[model samples]
Target chain A: MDPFLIKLIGFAAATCTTVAYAPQFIKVLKTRSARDISLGMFLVMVLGLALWLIYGLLSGDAPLIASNAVTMLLAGGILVMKLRYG
Target chain B: MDPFLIKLIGFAAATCTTVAYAPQFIKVLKTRSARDISLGMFLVMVLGLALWLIYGLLSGDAPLIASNAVTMLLAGGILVMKLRYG
Candidate 1:
């Protein structure tokens, strides 16, 4: 595959995965509850996303940076909501 | 930073995000419940990860391939559990 096409695929992949979280974010926000959300799971997610963000910064990987940054925010929001609603 | 070191960072990033899902997988497996999990979110996730896997294969990106493959499985498991438990 051409490098550009590969990058395009990568971007598509990133966009799809990142946007996927939106529904969950909206659900958690609307419900003002996260009872079914596992704290351990989201806590790790926040940490992991944060690390990926740092790695993105270091590597100059724009897609990784953008995707992980937004994901961290969304997942982090869910984590906070879980604690707040717990 | 050294290129090798950068690759290490990428690997670390991938590992963290990928391993982060393990907790959720275990939680869903143990409880066999996924009421809080959004069907749309996970359905999109599986599709996104599948694209990522294809992108990885085409680009020969090891980290992307490995991380997305494992994540797809974990996320896919949660999706199935959501349907089964719902």
Candidate 2:
């Protein structure tokens, strides 16, 4: 397969993974509760997404940078809510 | 940075991201509740992770395959629990 299409797939993949945060994001915001959220998990997740973002930035990989950056954005929000609510 | 080192970062990133699911996984299994999980988000995420897996497998990228494969393993589990519990 062409690299372009492959990257497109990756972009799609990243999009899905990033969007996965939506439910919790919306729920936490609307409900103003995140007691069920795991602190360790989101803490680790935010760190991982940050590293992934750095990796992509260093390597000049657009898909990775965008994916991790946006994901971190949502997950980071959830993390904050978890902390506040917990 | 060297490609090897770069890949190391990716592996680390992947590791963190994969492990991030631990809290929810444990909670869901223990409590047998997934009322807070969003069906649409995970539905999209599982689909995305599957795409990422396909992209990695097709390209023979070790990092991609390992990352997406393990993540899917976990996320898929969450998805299943959400469907079952909800």
Every candidate's DockQ is 0.44, 0.49
lDDT of 2 by residue, B1-86 (tens): 14355565567656766665544555444444346645566567566666766655554445666766565555556645556553
Per-model RMSD to reference: 4.7, 4.7
What does candidate 1's lDDT look like per residue over A1-86, in tens digits?
13344444567667876776655565555544346655666667677667766754544445666777576556556545556553
Q: Write the per-residue lDDT of candidate 2 for residues A4-82, one digit (tens) a residue.
A: 5545556665665665654546554554444664566656766766776665555444566676656655655654565
Q: How well does chain A score by TM in each candidate? A: 0.55, 0.51
B1-86, model 1: which lDDT tens digit per residue? Answer: 13454555566666764676656665545544336655667677677767766655544445666777576556556545556553
Quote the B-chain TM-score, candidate 2: 0.50
Residue B30's C-alpha lDDT in candidate 2?
47
For model 1 chain B, give the 10-residue run with minimal summed lDDT.
Answer: B1-10
Which residue ranges in model 2 land beyond 4 Å of their true spot?
Answer: A1-9, A16-24, A28-38, A83-86, B1-9, B28-38, B57-63, B76-86
Q: Second chain TM-score per prediction?
A: 0.55, 0.50
Residue B58, candidate 2: C-alpha displacement in angstroms: 6.2
What clash pairs does model 1 have?
A: none
